[PDB]
Write the structure tokens for this entry.
Amino acid sequence: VSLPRMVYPQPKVLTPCRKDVLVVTPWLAPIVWEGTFNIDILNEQFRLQNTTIGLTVFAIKKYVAFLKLFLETAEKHFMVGHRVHYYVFTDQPAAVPRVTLGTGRQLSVLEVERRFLSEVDYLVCVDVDMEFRDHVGVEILTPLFGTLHPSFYGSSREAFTYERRPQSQAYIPKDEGDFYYMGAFFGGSVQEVQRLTRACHQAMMVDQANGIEAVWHDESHLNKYLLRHKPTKVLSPEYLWDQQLLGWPAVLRKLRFTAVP
Ligand SMILES: O=c1ccn([C@@H]2O[C@H](COP(=O)(O)OP(=O)(O)O)[C@@H](O)[C@H]2O)c(=O)[nH]1
Ligand SMILES: COC(=O)CCCCCCCCO[C@@H]1O[C@H](CO)[C@H](O)[C@H](O)[C@H]1O
Ligand SMILES: [Cl-]
Ligand SMILES: [Hg+2]
Ligand SMILES: [Hg+2]
Ligand SMILES: [Hg+2]
Ligand SMILES: [Hg+2]
Ligand SMILES: [Hg+2]
Ligand SMILES: [Hg+2]
Ligand SMILES: [Mn+2]
């Protein structure tokens, strides 16, 4: 469907978006930083498609305590204006807090899937011991995306904590690797996310049988997958930070999703 008339600042071809950071990967995938996108145009594009975003989180044992802040802040900053379906996987259904949600947003509690394919267009998978502090919207939606780990975004590949043992399916040699993605925030279309989760599950089963466990578990496999299946968008550390441990550097114009102290 055609976009309606819109009035906004004209993009300037001879004026770089950001001159301090890389905003596009070598395989032409945008790296999402504040200043690279006009959210009004993007909101229009995704709303015209009546986009539904599923947000999945696991809250087991004492982690159910993080749900209230997580959901409350998600209501203020996550995909506001769009259809959102929260999926909370927990071992304590009765412990899930009663959070008030805006219109067009719902929450499903699953006690511990084709359902995802028929319910949402995109799946966003994150850790629950976090809080949203600023805008996290449709600028992240794409077939497959990963997020730059805050501890290695400025490091050389040799420093990346990839699994280095050739006996592991998550193995990545010192001369390979684009970025080190953190397992705490990834997503994409339901189809691509299920392909990724299926691939990692099978790879971890193989390691299990071979008597080996990847150095950083699921994250090690996530990195191996994204190395071989390039993400169509990469999120900057604005999307995964810890102000207490890492402060607020100039390169980050916004701190959007952070660890809870
Ligand atoms: O006993 C646990 C351990 C982990 N988690 C989930 O797994 C995520 C990632 O593990 P964790 O946050 O403990 O380590 P980090 O990922 O912070 O290194 C947690 O945020 C929770 O979402 C959980 O629900 N119960
Ligand atoms: C849960 O809170 C967050 O995700 C915010 C960012 C935390 C940044 C932590 C930086 C220090 C290292 O963290 C560890 O890094 C290894 C890989 O080297 C793994 O990713 C661990 O899960 C992570 O805790
Ligand atoms: Cl998840
Ligand atoms: Hg720009
Ligand atoms: Hg997920
Ligand atoms: Hg997750
Ligand atoms: Hg994998
Ligand atoms: Hg897995
Ligand atoms: Hg994975
Ligand atoms: Mn965490």
Q: What stands out?
A: The pocket of manganese (II) ion (ligand 10) is lined by residues 127, 129, 184 (CB under 6 Å). The domain at 1-261 is CATH 3.90.550.10 (Spore Coat Polysaccharide Biosynthesis Protein SpsA; Chain A).
